Amino acid sequence: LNTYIVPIYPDETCWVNDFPNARTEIYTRMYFNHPGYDDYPVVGISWEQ
Amino acid sequence: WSTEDLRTGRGCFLGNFKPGEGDYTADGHLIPSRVSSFSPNDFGLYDMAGNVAEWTSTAFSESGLKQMSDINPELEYKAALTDPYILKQKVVRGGSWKDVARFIRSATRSHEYQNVGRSYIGFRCVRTSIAFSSG
Amino acid sequence: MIQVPRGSIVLGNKEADSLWGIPAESRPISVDAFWMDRTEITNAQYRQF
Amino acid sequence: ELTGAKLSSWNEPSPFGMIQVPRGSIVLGNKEADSLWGIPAESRPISVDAFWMDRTEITNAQYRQFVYYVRDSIIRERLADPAYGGNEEYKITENKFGEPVTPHLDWSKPIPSEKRATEEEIAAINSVYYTNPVTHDRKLNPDQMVYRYEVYDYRSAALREHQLKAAKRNLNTDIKVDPNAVVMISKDTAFVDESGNIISETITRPLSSEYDFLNTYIVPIYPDETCWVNDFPNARTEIYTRMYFNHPGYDDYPVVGISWEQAQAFCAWRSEFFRKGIRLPEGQIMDDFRLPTEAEWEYAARMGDSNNKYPWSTEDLRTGRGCFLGNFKPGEGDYTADGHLIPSRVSSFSPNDFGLYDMAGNVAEWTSTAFSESGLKQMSDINPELEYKAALTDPYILKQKVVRGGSWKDVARFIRSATRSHEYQNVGRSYIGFRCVRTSIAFSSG
Amino acid sequence: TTLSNRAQEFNRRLTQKTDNAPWRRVVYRRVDLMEESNAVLYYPPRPIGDRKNLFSTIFGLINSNSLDVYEYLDGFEAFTDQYKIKFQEFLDRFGIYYQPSTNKNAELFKVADSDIPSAEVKAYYVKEEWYFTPTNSDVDIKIQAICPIMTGQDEFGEVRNQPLFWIPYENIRPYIARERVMLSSLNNTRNSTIDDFFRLNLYKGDIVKTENLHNRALAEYCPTPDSMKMESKRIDKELQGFRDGLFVTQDTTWMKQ
Amino acid sequence: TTLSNRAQEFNRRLTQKTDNAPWRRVVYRRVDLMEESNAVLYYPPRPIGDRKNLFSTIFGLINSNSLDVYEYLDGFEAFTDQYKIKFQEFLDRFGIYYQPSTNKNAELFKVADSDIPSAEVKAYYVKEEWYFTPTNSDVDIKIQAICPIMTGQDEFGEVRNQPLFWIPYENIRPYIARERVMLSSLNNTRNSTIDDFFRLNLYKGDIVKTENLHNRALAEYCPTPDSMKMESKRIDKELQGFRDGLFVTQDTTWMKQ
C-alpha cells in the first residue's frame, strides 16, 4: 500500500522566475484568476499535482 | 499533419510556435492560445503539437528505446527520497511555444525534473478501454 | 472523449541531422486501444477541483 | 463529470483620449553604420504585446489641474490644525452609522473665498502663497508643495530567493538549507521631522516579514521653469520663462522642464483619480499607468515594418510640395525653416498610420530603462525591460536614463527613430517632455 | 570602496549561466592588434597620465598581489592551485631589471617606466563558446580566458611568438569595468569601456583551434601560412549555416504552390 | 555509497538473461580508435582534471585492488582463479618506473603522471554475441569482454601489436556508469555515459574471428591485408541476411496474382 500528501495550488510564480529581465508580471496575477482566460491552457503544474 | 511543409496552402501557420528569430508573433499568438483555434488532425485530437508540452510517465535514460519490450512499452521507476537528484527526471514530449521549428518534430526528447514546474508544460489524461476484437 | 484504434508505428528517425550531433535511432512497436482527451486540461476543471 | 466551472466576467473600459496598438514584431537597430560618425553597427529583433497610448504629449492644462489638486489638499490640511484653529467639520472620523475608523479628509465642503472668509481663515489661506517685496507678485511657493505616494513592488516579491519560508528557497535535495538563512533587502522611506525638513534615507535590514517590499517617496512637484535661462548662455530667452507656464494662450502648447521623478509622480497620481470614480467589483484587476519602455516606443514609431527608417511613409525629409513634416531645425541656424522656433502647438503636422501624433520632433520623451552602451544585448526578446532603482549612496554615473526621439534642438541625424541619447534623472532641460501608456487586456481570438 | 546593496543585486541578474544547453561548441581565436579594428587595446604605446592600455593594467594588478594567473603548458589548460605562477620565475625568464621596493605591501618589486614591454605585445588569444539558451532559444557568446603573446629579436632574425600566461575572465571583470577608452580612429570621445568591447563581439581574427576528439591543433594538418588561412573560411560557414537553418522565416516554396 | 532499496530493484530488472535461445553466435571484432567514430574513448590523451578516458579509469581501479583481470594466453580464454594476474609481473614486462607508496592501503604503487601509456593505446577487442529472445522473438546484442592492445617502437621499425589483459563486463559495469563524455566532434555537451555507448552498438570495426569448429583464426586462411578485408563483407551479409529472412512483411507476389 502507498499513500502520499501533496499541495495542490498551482505554481503561479513561475512566469517571473523563468524569464529574467523581462516584463512578465502582467500574466502572473491574471492568468489563473481573470474570468476571460477560463478556456485558456493551464500552466505550472508539476508532475506530482 | 497531412503534408511535410510547415506552412499551409495560403500563407498561414498550422501551429502556435515561433517561426522566426524573435518573431514569436508570426504564428498569430504570443502566449499560449485558446484551444480549438487550429485545425485538427485525422483521428480527432486537437492542438497536438505546440501550445503547451505534455507530461509523460516514463523515466529518462539516453538508452531508453532499447530497454523496453515492444508490446505496450513502459519503463517505470518510483524514486526514493534518499537518492541523488539525477535519478528523478521524467520525459516531456511535444514542444511548446518556446521551441524552434526543430523541436516540434514528433520524435524529439526533452527532460524536466519532477519537482519543478515551468511556464510551458501542461498535461492531458488517457484511459484504458475495454472492447471486443471482432468489432 | 474520442477513440484510438489499434495498429503499429515506427519509432525514431533514420536520417540524423547533419548540423546537430544527435546520432540516429530506430525501433518498431505496437500498442493497444485507449481513449484520450480532446483538449488539454482547461482552467475551469482545475478550478473546480 | 468534470464539466468545469467558471467565474464572473468583467469588462475593460476604454479610457478617454486613447488609441490602440496591435501586436507584432520589429527589427531594432540599423545595419549600415554612418561613415562619418564613429558609431559601429548593432541589430537585434524583438516582439511586444498590446498596449494603449496617449495621442498627444501631456499638455499644460492637465499639469495645471494636478497642481491645483495638490494645492487644495494642502490647504484643507492647513485648515484643521491646532495653530490656525481646528474645525471638526472638515475632517471626519465618525461613521454615518456612528463608529470610529481611520481618519481622512473630506472633499465635500467648498473652500472659503479670499475676502469672504473669517480673519483666521484668511491667514490660513495665505500660508502657502509667496510674496516678493521688490516686484509685488504672488506665486505658489516652490518648496511647500510635496506629494507622497506609496507603491508596491510585485516583481521583486516573486523571485525564488525572496520567499519567506526556508523550505522553498532551493529545490535540490543534494544541497540542504540551514535554518539560519540571511538575505539582505533594501527599501525606501521618507521621514518628515519636527522642524519641517524632508529627509530621505535607504535602510538595509534582514528579510523577516513582508513590509520590506513597500516603498514610499516624497518629491516636489512644481515644474523647473528656470531651465530656459540656464540652458542657453548669452541669449535673450528671458521672454519665455515668465510666460511659458502662466499665460492662458499657451495652455495647449507642450510642457517643459519636468524631471524623471515628477514624471513618475504624475503617472502614479493618475491612477487614484481614475479609480476613485469607477467601480470594478469582480475579477477585473486593473493595471496602473506607467512610462513606456524602450521597446514599446520603438515599435510605436517604426510603424511596425522594418523598412521605414523614419516615422512617415517615404524616406525623404521634405514633402510633395516644399513643406517639412517635423518641427526640427533643417538648416544651420535656420531654426525657422520648419515653420516654428519654440515647441509648437500639438496637432499641427500630419499623423502617421496608426494614429499617433507629432511622433518625432517637438519635445523628446522619457523612458523607463537604464543607460549602458551594451543595452541591447542584455535584455531578453519578449517585452525587453531593464530596470534599476538607484540608491542615494551610489556615484553619480549610475543614474542615467535613456531619452529617445529628439526635439527641436536636434540636427537631421538625430531624428532617426533609432538613436540613443542620455540625460540624468535629477536635472530637467528645455527640450524634454513625456507621455503615458497603459497595459491592455484583450482576447487573442479577436 | 564597497558597492551598495542594490548594486550587488544588479550584478547577479546579468551574469550568464550555461548550466543546461543542448548545443555548445568551443573555438579559439587569434586577435591581431596591428589591424585598425583591434587597435583599441594598443592606444598608449607607453604609460601617459591615466590612460593605460590593457597589458599595462594587467601588470599593474599583479604587482599588488590582488590577482591570479596561471602558466601555459602546451596542449592542456586547467586552473588549479599547482599551476599558479610565482613572480620571481616569471620576471627572470623574460629579462627585466628589478629592485626591492621601499614599502613592504604597497609594491612587490620596483618596475621601470619603460622596461615593461607595452609596445611589443601584439596578439591576443581569446577562448569563447557558443551556446543555446534553453528558456529563450537564441544563440549567444561567452568569454572565458585571455592570454597575451609577445615578440622578440633573435640572432637568426626569427620572429618568435611566445605566450606569457592565462587569465580567468571573472577575476578581471571588476578592474576593467570603469576605465574608459575611445571606439574609433575618426571620433575620439571616451564613450565605452573595455568590458563592453568584448561583450559586443567587435574583434576580428583567424580561427586557430577547435575542440576535436583527436585533440590536434590546426597547424599540424596545415602545411603553409597560405594553406592555413583557407581552412578558416569553411569553419565560419558551419557556425553561420547553423543560425540560418534553425529558423524558418520565409521560403519561395509556399507562395507559388 | 550504498544504493537505495528501490535502486537495487531497477538493476535486476534490466539485466539481460540468455538462459534459453534457439540461435546464438559469437563474433570477435577489432575497434580502431583513430577513426572519428571510435574517437570517443581517446578524448584526453593525458590526465586533465576530472576528464578521464577509458584506459585511464581502468588503471585507476586496479591500483586500489577493487577489480579483477586475467592474462591473455593465445587461442583459449577462460576466467578462473589460476589465470589471475599479479601486479608485479605485469608492471615489469612493459617498462614503467614504480616506487613504494606512502599509504599502505590507499595506493599500491606510485605511478607517474605521464609514465602510464594513455596516448599509445589505439585498438580495442570487443567480444559479443547475437541471441534470439524466446519470449519476445527479436534479435539483440550483449557484450562480454574488452581487451586493450598497444603499440611500441622496435629496432627494425616493426609496428608491434600486443594485448595487455582481458576484462569481464560485469566487474566494470558499476565504475563506468556515471562518468560523462561527449558524443560528437561538432557538439560538445556531456550528455551520454560510456556505459550507454557500448549498449547502443555505435562502434565500427573489422571482424577478426568467429567460432568455427576447427578453431582457427581468420588470418591463418587470409594471405594479405588486402585479401583479409574482403572476407568481412560476406560475413556481414550472413548476419544481416538472417534478420530480413526471418520476417515476412511484404512481397510483390501477393499483390499481382
Author numbering:
A (entry chain B): 224 to 272
B (entry chain B): 322 to 456
C (entry chain B): 28 to 76
D (entry chain A): 11 to 456
E (entry chain D), F (entry chain E): 25 to 281
Sentences from the paper on this structure:
The type IX secretion system (T9SS) is a protein secretion machinery unique to the Bacteroidetes-Chlorobi-Fibrobacteres superphylum, which plays crucial roles in bacterial pathogenesis and gliding motility. It is composed of >15 proteins, including the proton-motive force-dependent PorLM motor, the PorKN ring anchored to the outer membrane, and the Sov translocon. Within the trans-envelope complex, PorK and PorN form a ~3 MDa ring structure approximately 50 nm in diameter beneath the outer membrane (OM), bridging the proton-motive force (pmf)-dependent PorLM molecular motor and the translocon Sov, thus representing a crucial component of the secretion machinery. Our structural analysis reveals that PorK contains a repurposed formylglycine-generating enzyme-like fold, which serves as a structural hub for complex assembly rather than enzymatic activity.
